[PDB]
Design a protein around this ligand. Structure first.
Ligand code: FMN
Ligand code: 6X1
Ligand code: DET
Ligand code: DOR
Length: 364
């Protein structure tokens, strides 16, 4: 699990041999078989966070979209992530967009994808999680929670009902649910982010959640785009506080193309992730934290590949962070790297632990 060997040799060679979707599929397969490094980094108490009704032994999770179908959850904990989010899962199976649909921008340390919610569907994922449900219960009790990100089918005629089905089927199996209302790659999905129908949508979601038995009742979070107007964000903050949404995930990929991208493939359609997204997502965290008065837990995601990247989102108001794209460039060692650097920076800047640092920028 040597960071330099993966970063300088293994990964560059893998990317030379495999297109990104092939690499992704191979990585999921290897991970689910435990064929990858087991974290030697043992988490210190400084990294522990309590939010969303759970203990997280460290604040660094794997973002949705890597393990879309729930196949590699245990290998991902083994890799050192403090929590795992699977999905997005749609109600029925669907294939997603035609290939190629994932693109590498090496010069920018970025990826563009237009997968389009390729999904095994709720039923398959349900049985997959049921097969390890008790193992997960112990992991969660141990401080390693599981999130499930819910999507909707391309041809769906009623978006709210798709999400409602997801709550009923996978909600009993998840520590938290994510209503993904921010994918760049499904027609019309992102406009579920406007006020009146976001309120209608989330009201129905929360009602379905509340109808689940107490011990099987997940937290519900909303995952938003980096691409929202001031008005959108203002409206989302309002609805979230009004309905009692448990948290926000900030952010999904961007449909923007920031000035300065060098990759040959920069003009491919889809969502951009990685380094070019980093500060855009950090600023969105900062804004949503202020609009919710620091009362609504935020998971910060976008361009995290170092302890500094993570701490900047934490200080901006994130209680937890996720990464994905950094894994595709640096490989598994990046997880321990981020955790180790985060702990060092926390001591360095005088924080007793992660919890003390949450939102710290707003208190200056
Ligand atoms: C290949 C790929 C597939 C993704 N699939 C999903 C998805 O299915 N559901 C979702 O909510 N986010 C998905 N995302 C977005 C990530 O969860 C994350 O929000 C985004 O990539 C920003 O974090 P990062 O810069 O560390 O990659 C995907 C991202 C990538 C790169
Ligand atoms: O996931 C990996 N690679 C990978 C390689 C290793 Cl050696 C380990 C792990 Cl977990 C993942 N790669 C990707 C995942 C999603 C989208 C694009 C890629 C890519 O390669 O461009
Ligand atoms: C029966 C429905 C089948 C849907 C399959 C969708 C593509 C799944 C490809 C493997 C997972 N992955 C995200 C790594 O491409
Ligand atoms: O939420 C999502 C969906 C994913 C996909 O296209 O499957 N692409 C993304 O970048 N974010």
């Amino acid at each position: 699990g040597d960071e330099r060997f993966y970063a300088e040799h293994l990964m560059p060679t893998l990317q030379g041999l495999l297109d990104p979707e092939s690499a992704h599929r191979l990585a999921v397969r290897f991970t689910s078989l435990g064929l990858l490094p087991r974290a030697r980094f043992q988490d210190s108490d400084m990294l522990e966070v309590r939010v969303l009704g759970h203990k997280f032994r460290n604040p660094v999770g794997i973002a949705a979209g890597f393990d879309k179908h729930g196949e590699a959850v245990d290998g991902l904990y083994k890799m050192g992530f403090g929590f795992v989010e699977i999905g997005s899962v749609t109600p029925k199976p669907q294939e997603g967009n035609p290939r190629p649909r994932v693109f590498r921008l090496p010069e920018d340390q970025a990826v563009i994808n237009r997968y389009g919610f390729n999904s095994h569907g709720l039923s398959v994922v349900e049985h997959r999680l049921r097969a390890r449900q008790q193992k997960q219960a112990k992991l969660t009790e141990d401080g390693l929670p599981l999130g499930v990100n819910l999507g909707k089918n391309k041809t769906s005629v009623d978006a709210a009902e798709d999400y409602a089905e997801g709550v009923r089927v996978l909600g009993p199996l998840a520590d938290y649910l994510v209503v993904n209302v921010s994918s760049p790659n499904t027609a019309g999905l992102r406009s579920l982010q406007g006020k009146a129908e976001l309120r209608r949508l989330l009201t129905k979601v929360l009602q379905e959640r509340d109808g689940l038995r107490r011990v099987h009742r997940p937290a519900v979070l909303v995952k938003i785009a980096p691409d929202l107007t001031s008005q959108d964000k203002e409206d989302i903050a309002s609805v979230v506080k009004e309905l009692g949404i448990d948290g926000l995930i900030v952010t999904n990929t961007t449909v923007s193309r920031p000035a300065g991208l060098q990759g040959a493939l920069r003009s491919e359609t889809g969502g951009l992730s990685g380094k070019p997204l980093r500060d855009l997502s950090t600023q969105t965290i900062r804004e949503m934290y202020a609009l919710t008065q620091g009362r609504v837990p935020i998971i910060g995601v976008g361009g995290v590949s170092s302890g500094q990247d993570a701490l900047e989102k934490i200080r901006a108001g994130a209680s937890l962070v996720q990464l994905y794209t950094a894994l595709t460039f640096w490989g598994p060692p990046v997880v321990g790297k981020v955790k180790r650097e985060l702990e060092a920076l926390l001591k360095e800047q005088g924080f007793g632990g992660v919890t003390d640092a949450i939102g710290a920028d707003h208190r200056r």
